[PDB]
Structure 1
Amino acid sequence: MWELTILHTNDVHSRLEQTSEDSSKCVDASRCMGGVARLFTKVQQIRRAEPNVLLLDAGDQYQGTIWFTVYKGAEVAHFMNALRYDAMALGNHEFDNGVEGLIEPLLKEAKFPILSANIKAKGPLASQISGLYLPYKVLPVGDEVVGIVGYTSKETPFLSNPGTNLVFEDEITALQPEVDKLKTLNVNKIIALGHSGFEMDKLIAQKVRGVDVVVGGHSNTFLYTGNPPSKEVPAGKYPFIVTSDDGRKVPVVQAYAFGKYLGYLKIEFDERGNVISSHGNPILLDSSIPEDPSIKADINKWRIKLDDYSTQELGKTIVYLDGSSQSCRFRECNMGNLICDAMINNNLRHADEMFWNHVSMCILNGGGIRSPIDERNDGTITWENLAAVLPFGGTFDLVQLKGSTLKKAFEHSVHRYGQSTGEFLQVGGIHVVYDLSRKPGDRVVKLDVLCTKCRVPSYDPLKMDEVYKVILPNFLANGGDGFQMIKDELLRHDSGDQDINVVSTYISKMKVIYPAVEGRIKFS
């Protein structure tokens, strides 16, 4: 039998350094997790112990801390090379700085193949980018060869900045003839590695004949067999087994996000490449694993340039600033309240003619909030802390909407509630109540809004046929996260200030902050 060890990461999102266990900045060093130094130690240990090992990344290394703000992906190429990754698939965040921001820092510097079979280049772009990413790579592993075929979320154009000259084809349609090619080349072991989300991963496993294993990402899925070692709750066993339409058992794996875990799957193949068995579990990268001293020293080197985003205290928090996805995608979270209060404040700083100009209302996609902040380091808030919460460089815009437009937005907010999706709205100037037992599109059972046409602001039931001034991310003003109604029906859009500056100025002005969860969003 020939045994393959697959070690995999996904949605690392610029956590080059170890982190608190909620993936924010490490403060209590003795209990930190993740980071590429600790990852290295563990991979090294596994490579000593197992003869056939591949280390794979399923995309979304780009975007998430000051590391990326500053080094713009040059840190990704540098440290992925140091860890000796064997292959990476392109994720949507790889395109955030446009194709140019992927070509120059990453594709031209990586020492391993970068993959995606469903991304097709056209127009003036097709010539530059040719050869820089590949549909697949066949890799020698010991005496054998393993084919890796890449794929990338078909909805990257609605998520990132890939430009007008790249086409994202259906993953299953694009993947099949590549896997078919590999088979005619007599490659009988085939891993599909890519970045479309666990639901698409399962369908690729089901539908692409010849795929032996799927290694995926994008949905930050945590899978586990046995008693999970930390706060993440398993969505299924590890590996998750899909039975293909031609009858094969196909393991499907993902390993959460932020470099907190290393996925580890061992696959037993026979000499024809049939999977006899597989097993494993993600490995929690906690402090019981030591940080490699070489990689850590090189991280400390690179870190020097990052220190002046932590040089100044902006303000303090005396409460935990809960920007976790498990809160912000599911209920009112105090990081979302703080941000909306800054957006409204920033506006109502230049307002009042009367009953108009006053904008009283804010909404904010909870998935746009990308990290918590911890109150325990004497509670200091720095530019670096804020940059991990708001890494996209968006702006907070003013939009005018109808009551009816807004009610449909709130129905959209919870239309598929329960899947940790980013559309769930955090708010200010708005008291919404949902009843999730009702049907999608009919779950909003109360929606009050803060009058602006009044001398004392108080909450009144929203009116379907009235018009309202809402502050919200440009992401949302453009129909991001499926808020088609907003793009389609707004009656006015104006651009606003940079997101991080807004929140930063607000914090500096308050000096000490303490946002509560206060019943702006309730469930019936």
Structure 2
Amino acid sequence: YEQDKTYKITVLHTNDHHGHFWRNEYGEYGLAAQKTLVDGIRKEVAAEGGSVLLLSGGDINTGVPESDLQDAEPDFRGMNLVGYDAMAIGNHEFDNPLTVLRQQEKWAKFPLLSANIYQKSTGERLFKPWALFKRQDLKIAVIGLTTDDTAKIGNPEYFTDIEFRKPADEAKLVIQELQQTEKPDIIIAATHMGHYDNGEHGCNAPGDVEMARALPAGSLAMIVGGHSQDPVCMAAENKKQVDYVPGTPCKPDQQNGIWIVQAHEWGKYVGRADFEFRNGEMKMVNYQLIPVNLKKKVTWEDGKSERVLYTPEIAENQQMISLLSPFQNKGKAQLEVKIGETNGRLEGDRDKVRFVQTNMGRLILAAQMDRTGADFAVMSGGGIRDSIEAGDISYKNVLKVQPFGNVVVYADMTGKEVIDYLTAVAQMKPDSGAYPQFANVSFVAKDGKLNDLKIKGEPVDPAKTYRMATLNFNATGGDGYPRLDNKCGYVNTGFIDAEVLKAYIQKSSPLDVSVYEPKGEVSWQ
């Protein structure tokens, strides 16, 4: 570069897009409004003498039926039209086989990066570790890293020949290789690892904060993150704002001289970090998280309910809407295709599910345990929102039963944590949404205490390990359920309730409802 010259560099970022190429049902986000916003930024940045780099923290895949059924094709193409420069590979990039991910890499006109994922049989990288960019006459390297929780938490049959090495250790190596060979002026990491306040990752793999603290000071200008699905806007040193409000000031984290940023999920925001580079040094001069037509739900004095924009409305780019519409249309048609059949009614009438054990509870929970490899499972009966009629089943029928996009989760727990949890959960009452549906659970409750507690037909052993499935809602205290998210053994899978029930029905069909029919395994009084 030229000594004593100030370069202007604007870094844009998103992450955890999870199939949200289309806006949602209240008119928020979507890539069309993203495109309008980012196109306008590029012109402004250029008018002021600067350059743009646009990066993703990954997890493009998995979260919306119309995207998932088309292997995220609309998403990746849309990202081309927005103009992404690079992306980190996310754990949900491994939800589908490598055949599909390699096809995504060819759909994408930008690299999908990860330095830390190796083939076990050869010791070679499966992906490109970094990409180099020219902006002005600066050389900018972007390294990609992926959480090493991927393979403890994803389909084991996919990871026979795939190893996830510690990312922080990989970053130290790549930074040293880069600094000894290509010699970039600036290095940024796009990662998929997560932001934990003060590096308190608990039982998750270490994330961005721990990494930045482990690296040499200032060796990265910044980390563009993901996976935890947070707006990184600090309330105070080492503490994110809880309930960040769109359109407000957002101070990103800085740890050991390294900025750490994240833009939540689902294209809700485009993050914008403006930097000035002079004589080797990067200075952050402005940061903002820019809402993409995010709205707040309000009920005013008169019971008129609306969603109100936090910031001025961004118009949908028409060229992105032409690109995306045929996928949206094909996805909506794919929802009506038969995915299974049942030989009797699956019962999800509001009363039945809030009062007694139904065959819909058993079907949903089998689906959740099949997905997480769990031993047993519970949810709120008021999570079940409809029945499926005896006969053919479409994804659309399943979306009626599970329409609100909750996330399936699991927890590993001692037989004794099992006993303490099911105990307080069996205190929940009928005529109420909190009423527990259970699977692979048998007991007789009397006096708020459990007698003949059986997971899958065997008594519980207090020093045994058991895997429970449930929903994110129940796991974070919802329905006054005992919190599981601050426990060791907890894992948020990112898989959506309707997708999990649909997949389970597709592979189990045709269904024989008698295997799902409750035979009095749980009872009270």
Q: Distance in 2 between matches of 1:203 and 1:485?
A: 20
DSSP-derived class of the 1:198 partner? coil
Q: Distance in 1 between matches of 2:354 and 2:175?
A: 48
Q: How many residues align?
A: 394
User: Would the alpha carbon gap of residues 187 and 431 (structure 1) be closer, same or farther in structure 2, given more than 3 Å must change?
Assistant: same
Q: What displacement does 1:117 show? A: 1.1
User: Would the alpha carbon gap of residues 87 and 194 (structure 1) be closer, same or farther in structure 2, given more than 3 Å must change?
Assistant: same
User: Would the alpha carbon gap of residues 383 and 142 (structure 1) be closer, same or farther in structure 2, given more than 3 Å must change?
Assistant: farther
User: Would the alpha carbon gap of residues 91 and 385 (structure 1) be closer, same or farther in structure 2, given more than 3 Å must change?
Assistant: farther
**CA deviation map 1:418-468 (0-9, x unaligned):** xxxxxxx9x9973379xxxxxxxxxxxxx9x999666xx8774135x7424
Counterpart of 1:73 in structure 2 is: 72
The one-letter code matched in structure 2 to 1:172 is A
User: Would the alpha carbon gap of residues 146 and 258 (structure 1) be closer, same or farther in structure 2, given more than 3 Å must change?
Assistant: same
Counterpart of 1:264 in structure 2 is: 272
Equivalent residues of 1:409, 1:483 under 8 A apart: no
Asked if residue 143 in structure 1 is aligned to residue 143 in structure 2, the reply is no
Match among 169, 192, 196 for residue 195 of structure 1: 192
The one-letter code matched in structure 2 to 1:293 is Q
DSSP-derived class of the 1:88 partner? strand
Match among 170, 183, 188 for residue 186 of structure 1: 183
Q: How does 1:43-442 map to 2 (within 5 A)?
A: 43-50=38-45, 51-103=50-102, 105-123=103-121, 130=126, 133-161=127-155, 162-184=158-180, 185-199=182-196, 200-209=207-216, 210-224=219-233, 232-233=243-244, 238-244=250-256, 248=257, 250-272=258-280, 274-286=281-293, 288-309=313-334, 343-344=360-361, 346=363, 362-363=377-378, 383=398, 405-409=414-418, 430-431=426-427
DSSP-derived class of the 2:159 partner? coil
The one-letter code matched in structure 1 to 2:269 is Y
The one-letter code matched in structure 2 to 1:290 is A
DSSP-derived class of the 1:145 partner? strand
The one-letter code matched in structure 2 to 1:285 is V
User: Would the alpha carbon gap of residues 192 and 466 (structure 1) be closer, same or farther in structure 2, given more than 3 Å must change?
Assistant: same
DSSP-derived class of the 2:107 partner? coil
**CA deviation map 1:315-341 (0-9, x unaligned):** 9x999xxxxxxxxxxxxxxxx989996
Q: Distance in 1 between matches of 2:170 and 2:194?
A: 16
Equivalent residues of 1:409, 1:485 under 8 A apart: no
Counterpart of 2:501 in structure 1 is: 499
Q: Distance in 1 between matches of 2:53 and 2:357?
A: 44
DSSP-derived class of the 1:72 partner? coil
Equivalent residues of 2:365, 2:378 under 8 A apart: no
DSSP-derived class of the 2:22 partner? coil
Please give the root-mean-square deviation of Cα atoms over the aligned residues, in Å: 5.0
Q: Distance in 2 between matches of 1:196 and 1:136?
A: 16
DSSP-derived class of the 1:47 partner? helix
DSSP-derived class of the 1:76 partner? helix
Q: Distance in 2 between matches of 1:452 and 1:225?
A: 46
Q: Distance in 1 between matches of 2:285 and 2:398?
A: 45
Counterpart of 1:2 in structure 2 is: 7
Q: Distance in 1 between matches of 2:265 and 2:419?
A: 28
Structure 2: 5+ residue stretches without partners: 1-5, 197-206, 236-240, 294-308, 338-344, 367-375, 387-395, 430-435, 458-465, 471-483, 492-498, 507-525
Q: What displacement does 1:75 show? A: 2.6
Q: Distance in 2 between matches of 1:70 and 1:347?
A: 20
**CA deviation map 1:286-317 (0-9, x unaligned):** 170001011012211221211225559x99x9
TM-score w.r.t. length of structure 2:
0.62
DSSP-derived class of the 1:282 partner? strand
User: Would the alpha carbon gap of residues 144 and 431 (structure 1) be closer, same or farther in structure 2, given more than 3 Å must change?
Assistant: same
User: Would the alpha carbon gap of residues 502 and 429 (structure 1) be closer, same or farther in structure 2, given more than 3 Å must change?
Assistant: farther
The one-letter code matched in structure 1 to 2:71 is K
Counterpart of 1:38 in structure 2 is: 33
User: Would the alpha carbon gap of residues 2 and 477 (structure 1) be closer, same or farther in structure 2, given more than 3 Å must change?
Assistant: same
Q: Distance in 1 between matches of 2:242 and 2:403?
A: 20
DSSP-derived class of the 2:276 partner? strand
User: Would the alpha carbon gap of residues 163 and 345 (structure 1) be closer, same or farther in structure 2, given more than 3 Å must change?
Assistant: closer
Q: What displacement does 1:12 show? A: 0.7
User: Would the alpha carbon gap of residues 501 and 170 (structure 1) be closer, same or farther in structure 2, given more than 3 Å must change?
Assistant: closer
The one-letter code matched in structure 2 to 1:192 is A
Equivalent residues of 1:212, 1:251 under 8 A apart: yes
Equivalent residues of 2:426, 2:448 under 8 A apart: no
Q: What displacement does 1:233 show? A: 2.4
DSSP-derived class of the 1:300 partner? helix
Equivalent residues of 1:122, 1:167 under 8 A apart: yes
Q: Distance in 2 between matches of 1:99 and 1:202?
A: 30
Counterpart of 1:377 in structure 2 is: none
User: Would the alpha carbon gap of residues 221 and 390 (structure 1) be closer, same or farther in structure 2, given more than 3 Å must change?
Assistant: closer
Identity of aligned residues (%): 23
DSSP-derived class of the 1:177 partner? helix
Counterpart of 2:17 in structure 1 is: 12
Q: Distance in 2 between matches of 1:343 and 1:405?
A: 28
The one-letter code matched in structure 1 to 2:184 is V
Q: Distance in 2 between matches of 1:295 and 1:169?
A: 37
Q: Distance in 2 between matches of 1:87 and 1:72?
A: 19
Q: How does 1:436-451 map to 2 (within 5 A)?
A: none
Q: Distance in 1 between matches of 2:229 and 2:490?
A: 27
Q: What displacement does 1:83 show? A: 1.7
Counterpart of 2:454 in structure 1 is: 467
Q: What displacement does 1:122 show? A: 2.6
Equivalent residues of 1:60, 1:94 under 8 A apart: yes
Q: What displacement does 1:188 show? A: 2.1
Equivalent residues of 1:6, 1:265 under 8 A apart: yes
The one-letter code matched in structure 1 to 2:378 is I
User: Would the alpha carbon gap of residues 167 and 453 (structure 1) be closer, same or farther in structure 2, given more than 3 Å must change?
Assistant: closer
Q: What displacement does 1:183 show? A: 2.0
**CA deviation map 1:391-420 (0-9, x unaligned):** 99x999xxxx9xx95541477x8xxxxxxx
TM-score w.r.t. length of structure 1:
0.63
Q: Distance in 2 between matches of 1:264 and 1:176?
A: 26
